[PDB]
Subunit: 407 residues, 2 copies
C-alpha cells in the first residue's frame, strides 16, 4: 500500500534526525575553561549526526526500494515492516555506541546485530511475498515470467547483513581496522558493475524531505518549550518581580527561533518549488537531496550560536546555509542530464518559469556568498539584514523576476 509508506518515511525521517538533539543543546557558552574539549565535542557530535543521518537515509532507501517491488501490502507485511522500523530506529543508538566506544568490540557486535536484524526482516518480507505472489509489483511476476528475480532480490537485501556479520566476526579476534567490510554495505549498492536499483520516486523522497524539514524547523521551539519558559520561583530570582524582565532575558532565544524557522521554512519552500516540476528523479538527485537534508539539519545549531568575535559564529551560520543551499542548487544544476525525463516541460531550458526557478533557488547561495564577501567589511553584521531581505524578497520575487525578464 502507498499510504503505509507515509508513516514509514515520517518515522524514518525522525530517526534520521534523532542525532541533531545533542547537537542543538551543547553548552556553547565558553565560560567553562575547556574550550578545546568543547570544540572536540562539537566536532564529534557533528560527525556522528552526519554519519547517522547518512546511515538512516541508506536504510530508508533500502526499505522504499524493497517496497517498490512489493508495493501491494497486507497486514502481515505491515507487522513485518513495523519490525523493520524497530530495527532502523535502533540503528542510530548502535552507531553512537561505536563512536563513543570505538576500541570495544561490543559496539561493532551490536551494530551488526542490528544490521542482521533489518536484513532478516527484509528477507522474511521477501519470503512471505514469494510464498503468496499476489501482492508483488505489477511487472515483477504479474507480468514477467522470470522468477529468478527472487535470487537478485535476496542478494540485494542480504549482501549487507552478511558482510556486517563477517566484519563482526573479524573484529572479534582480528585487527579492528576491519571497518571497510562494513563500508561495503554502501559501497556495493553504489557500484553497478554487476529494476531493483531504480531511482526513488519523487513522492517518497519528497515526503522524507518534508518530514526532516519539519523536524529541523520545529526542534528549536522544542528547545524553547523544554526549559526556556520562566520558572515560578524564577520571578523571585534575580530580584525581578515581573514577567517582562524574564521574557526579555529569554528574548534572544526567541529571535534565534525566529531566524531559524524563517530560514528553514523558506529553504523548504525552495525545495518544494523545485520538486513540484520534477517527474522522474535520478540517483544523483537522491544523493544531492540526502546531502542537502544532512546539511540543512544543522541550521538550528548555526543560528543558535549566531544569536548569542561573533563574526566567526556568523561565518559558521552562513557556511552552513551555503552548504545546505548549494546542495539544493546541485539538484537543479543536474538538468543537463536530460530535461525531458527529469523536469516538467513548462520549466525546461528556455521555459516559462525558467529564470524563476534559477533565481528562486539561487538567492540563498547568493545571500551566503554576499555574506562571504561582506566578511571583509567590519560592519559584517548583515546576516540579520540578509535575513530580512531574503524573507522579504520572495513575497515580491515574482514582480522582480517579471521586471528582470521585461528588459
Amino acid at each position: 500500500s502507498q499510504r503505509m509508506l507515509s508513516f514509514s518515511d515520517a518515522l524514518l525521517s525522525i530517526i534520521a534526525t534523532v542525532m541533531i538533539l545533542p547537537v542543538t543543546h551543547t553548552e556553547i557558552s565558553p565560560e567553562q575553561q575547556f574550550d578545546r574539549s568543547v570544540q572536540r565535542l562539537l566536532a564529534t557530535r557533528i560527525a556522528v549526526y552526519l554519519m547517522t543521518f547518512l546511515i538512516v537515509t541508506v536504510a530508508w532507501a533500502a526499505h522504499t526500494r524493497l517496497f517498490q517491488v512489493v508495493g501491494k501490502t497486507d497486514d502481515t507485511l505491515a507487522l513485518l515492516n513495523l519490525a523493520c522500523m524497530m530495527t532502523i530506529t535502533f540503528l542510530p543508538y548502535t552507531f553512537s555506541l561505536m563512536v563513543t566506544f570505538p576500541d570495544v568490540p561490543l559496539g561493532i557486535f551490536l551494530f551488526c546485530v542490528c544490521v542482521i536484524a533489518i536484513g532478516v526482516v527484509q528477507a522474511l518480507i521477501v519470503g512471505y511475498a514469494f510464498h503468496f505472489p499476489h501482492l508483488l509489483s505489477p511487472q515483477i511476476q504479474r507480468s514477467a515470467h522470470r522468477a529468478l528475480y527472487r535470487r537478485h532480490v535476496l542478494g540485494i537485501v542480504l549482501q549487507g547483513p552478511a558482510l556486517c556479520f563477517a566484519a563482526a566476526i573479524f573484529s572479534l579476534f582480528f585487527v579492528p581496522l576491519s571497518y571497510l567490510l562494513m563500508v561495503t554495505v554502501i559501497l556495493l549498492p553504489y557500484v553497478s558493475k554487476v529494476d531493483l536499483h531504480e531511482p526513488l520516486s519523487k513522492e517518497r523522497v519528497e515526503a522524507f524531505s518534508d518530514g526532516v524539514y519539519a523536524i529541523v524547523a520545529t526542534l528549536l521551539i522544542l528547545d524553547i518549550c523544554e526549559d526556556n519558559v520562566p520558572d515560578p520561583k524564577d520571578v523571585k530570582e534575580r530580584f525581578s518581580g515581573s514577567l517582562v524582565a524574564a521574557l526579555s532575558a529569554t528574548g534572544p532565544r526567541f529571535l534565534a527561533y525566529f531566524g531559524s524557522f524563517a530560514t528553514v521554512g523558506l529553504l523548504w519552500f525552495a525545495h518544494h518549488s523545485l520538486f513540484l516540476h520534477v517527474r522522474k528523479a535520478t540517483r544523483a538527485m537522491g544523493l544531492l537531496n540526502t546531502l542537502s537534508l544532512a546539511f540543512v539539519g544543522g541550521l538550528p545549531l548555526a543560528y543558535q550560536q549566531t544569536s548569542a568575535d561573533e563574526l566567526e559564529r556568523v561565518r559558521v551560520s552562513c557556511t552552513i546555509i551555503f552548504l545546505a543551499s548549494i546542495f539544493q542548487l546541485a539538484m537543479w544544476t543536474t538538468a543537463l542530464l536530460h530535461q525531458a525525463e527529469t523536469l516538467q516541460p513548462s520549466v525546461w531550458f528556455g521555459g516559462r518559469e525558467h529564470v524563476l526557478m534559477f533565481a528562486k533557488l539561487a538567492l540563498y547561495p547568493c545571500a551566503s556568498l554576499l555574506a562571504f564577501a561582506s566578511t571583509c567589511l567590519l560592519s559584517r553584521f548583515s546576516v540579520g539584514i540578509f535575513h530580512l531581505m531574503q524573507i522579504a524578497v520572495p513575497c515580491a520575487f515574482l514582480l522582480l523576476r517579471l521586471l528582470v525578464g521585461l528588459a
Copy 2:
C-alpha cells in the same frame, strides 16, 4: 496545492506533540521527599499537554478548512501559510506561559497576540484569494455566483481572534475570570445554530494521525539517544571495566522502548486499518480521532513508569491504553450513523471483513479490560504477557478470525 498540506500536517502534528517532551522525562523516581509536589507536577504537565494538543488540533482544523476553500495555492499563499505555521508553532509556548503564570495578565496578552496573529494571517490569505479569485475551490466561485460567501469566510476566520482580543482587553482591567471569552473560539465553531463547516477529509486527518503516531512512537528512542548511552568516563565509574555492565544497567529503558514502540505501532496499525475503508469522515469521527491521539500520546510516559507497589504503575499504563483504544473503537462504533457514506461497502454491516475489523480494533480494549479484571489476582504482572500475546496474535489474527467465522 494538495502537497503543501503534507508539510502543514507534519509540522502541526509535531507542534501538537511538543508538550509531551517535559511529560516523558519527569523524574518519576520517588527518592526525593517531594512526592505530593511530584504528583502535582505530573498533574499539571498532563493537563497542559492535553490542552495544548487540543488547541493545536483546533488550529490545524481551522487551517485545513481554510485550505479546502483555497485548495489551489500559489507561492504567495505558501509564504502566508508558512507565517501561519510560525503562529501555530508559537501558540503552545503562550499556552504554557498562561499555565505557569495564571494571575499575570501578560500570558493572556501574549496568547491573544498569537491568536490575533494567526487570525490576521488567515485574513490576509483570504484577501489575497479574493483579489485574484482564480485559485479558489472549484465550486466556491468557479461554479457559484455568490460572492457573499466571502463574508462568511471572513467571519469564521476572524470570530476567534476578535473574541480573544476582547478577552485580553477585559483581563487588562477587569476580573481575570473572563476565560470564557477565550473558550468561545472553540465554543462557536462547535455550535451550529447559525460548506465551511464540512468535515475534514480522510487524507489530512489520517496524515495528522500518522505524524503524531510516528512522533509518539519515536520519542522514547529520542530519550534513549539523548543521555542513556554509557559515557566514556562511566566505564571507569561504578568499578565496571566493561560495557556489558552498563548496557545491562540501561537495559530496562530499552525494554521500555520495546514495549512502547510495539504498542504504539500496533495501535497505529489498527488506526490505519480502520482508516483504509473510510471514504467520508464526520465531525464526530474527527473529534474521536483527536481525543484518541491525545490519549495515545501518553503511552511513552505510561510504559516509562511501568518498566521501572508497581501494580499501580501497571494500572496507569493499562488505563492509558484503555482510553487511547476506546477512543479509537468509538470511531468504528460511529457506523450506526450511516454505513453507506462512512465505510466502504466491503466492510459494511454483515460485510466481508466485518468481524475482522470489530476484533482487530477490539483486542486492545479487550486486553486492557482483561488487565482490569486481572488486577484482582495477586500475580497481575500479565501486562508483559499481554504485550507478547497482543503483538503475537495479529500475525495469526487472520487465521483466528477465519476459525471463528467457520463455526
